[PDB]
Amino acid sequence: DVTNAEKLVYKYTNIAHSANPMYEAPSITDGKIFFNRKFKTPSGKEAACASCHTNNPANVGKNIVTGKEIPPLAPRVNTKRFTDIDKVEDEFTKHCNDILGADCSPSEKANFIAYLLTETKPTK
Ligand code: HEC
Numbered sequence: 567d568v569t570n571a572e573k574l575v576y577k578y579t580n581i582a583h584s585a586n587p588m589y590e591a592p593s594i595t596d597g598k599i600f601f602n603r604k605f606k607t608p609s610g611k612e613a614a615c616a617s618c619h620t621n622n623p624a625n626v627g628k629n630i631v632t633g634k635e636i637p638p639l640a641p642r643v644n645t646k647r648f649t650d651i652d653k654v655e656d657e658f659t660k661h662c663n664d665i666l667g668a669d670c671s672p673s674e675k676a677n678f679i680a681y682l683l684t685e686t687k688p689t690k
Pocket residue numbers: 601613614615616617618619628629630631636637639657658659661662665666678
């Protein structure tokens with residue numbers, strides 16, 4: 567739920583700030599840029615988190631590889647997101663690995679989840 571997401575924001579912020587002293591607090595802007603930024607897959611095709619999750623994490627997404635729908639990521643809309651916070655940290659590390667080839671950095675996770683807490687409205 568939102569509570570659990572908000573607590574992982576603190577956790578990742580504090581990790582990031584230890585590693586990277588100039589990072590002090592989450593940036594919702596940078597979290598949004600990261601979610602929408604086009605990166606280059608090995609093939610040269612560009613993709614973004616938004617390719618599957620849409621440009622609004624409050625909406626239902628669709629996996630471009632399988633065509634399968636994906637529940638919304640924004641915990642205010644889909645309150646099951648971040649229900650088992652331990653499980654979630656492992657899943658998200660695995661998921662970063664799968665999508666990007668390596669884990670997301672602690673500041674990317676803090677910024678991203680912070681951004682998610684701001685998206686409470688599905689695009690209509
Ligand atoms: C399709 C190829 C995807 C792209 C590109 C990204 N994500 Fe994804 N995401 C996708 C699936 C099939 C799932 C699992 C099904 C489900 O309902 O959970 C996810 C899940 C997430 C989650 C939930 C937690 C988790 O399972 O790790 C998060 C927070 C998430 N995705 C974030 C995310 C980010 C930040 C991405 C860019 C780096 C990204 N996803 C890309 C499908 C796809």
